């Protein structure tokens, strides 16, 4: 069946590109490359305002949760790159409930990733969702970071060992997370979400 929610959840989609540079004066360790709040419909990294309305470009699951008011899920990332085997660096990835800024290796769940060992198709990794209750709320006003109960937290990617590269190769590389939503679940239909054609009520 093609209308089952699990069928919708199971398709990966690229979210956005992220440069890492880059030969000569490589960015200093502890420089964040990415901050990814854990929600399909966050206004920050999805979409933009247009005619007062805050439109949101995105994958179908995001619409599916855009319609219901309450939701719950776990994340399954697949990191992927545009590199030669002449680039070489390491990365940290933390999962931060109610936090911000890099938080050492000790304080929180962390997961070092060597670049050179990432053959293609990339590397899968999964994160658990810690939160005070069972159901997240969907819609939020916020135009930057997630509000509060709207999201479980944040995932944060940053350099550990700064990149180095041969003179024979371009200075910088490009990381491209792919993702899917494990164990998605929805409740209480009804919302203002709807298609971007037109922008007005008839009268």
């Amino acid at each position: 069946d093609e209308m089952s929610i699990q069928y919708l959840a199971s398709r990966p989609y690229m979210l956005d590109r992220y440069t890492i540079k880059g030969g000569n004066t490589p960015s200093p360790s502890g420089t964040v490359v990415a901050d990814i709040p854990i929600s399909p419909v966050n206004y920050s990294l999805y979409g933009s305002i247009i005619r007062d309305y805050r439109t949101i470009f995105g994958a179908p699951v995001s619409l599916a949760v855009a319609m219901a008011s309450w939701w719950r899920a776990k994340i399954h990332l697949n990191l992927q790159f545009a590199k030669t085997q002449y680039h070489q660096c390491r990365l940290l990835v933390q999962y931060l409930p109610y936090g911000s800024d890099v938080q050492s290796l000790e304080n929180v769940l962390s997961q070092i990733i060597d670049i050179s060992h990432v053959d293609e198709s990339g590397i899968d990794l999964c994160f658990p969702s810690i939160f005070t209750n069972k159901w997240m709320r969907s819609y939020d006003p916020a135009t930057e970071g997630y509000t509060a109960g709207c999201a479980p937290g944040r995932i944060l990617i940053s350099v550990l060992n700064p990149l180095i590269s041969a003179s024979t190769v371009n200075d910088d590389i490009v990381m491209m997370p792919w993702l899917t939503w494990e164990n998605l679940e929805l409740a209480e239909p009804g919302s203002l979400a709807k298609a971007a054609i037109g922008f007005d009520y008839p009268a």
Partner: peptide, 8 residues
């Protein structure tokens, strides 16, 4: 189970 070097 081995990284595929670009053409080597």
């Amino acid at each position: 189970s081995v990284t595929n070097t670009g053409g080597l």
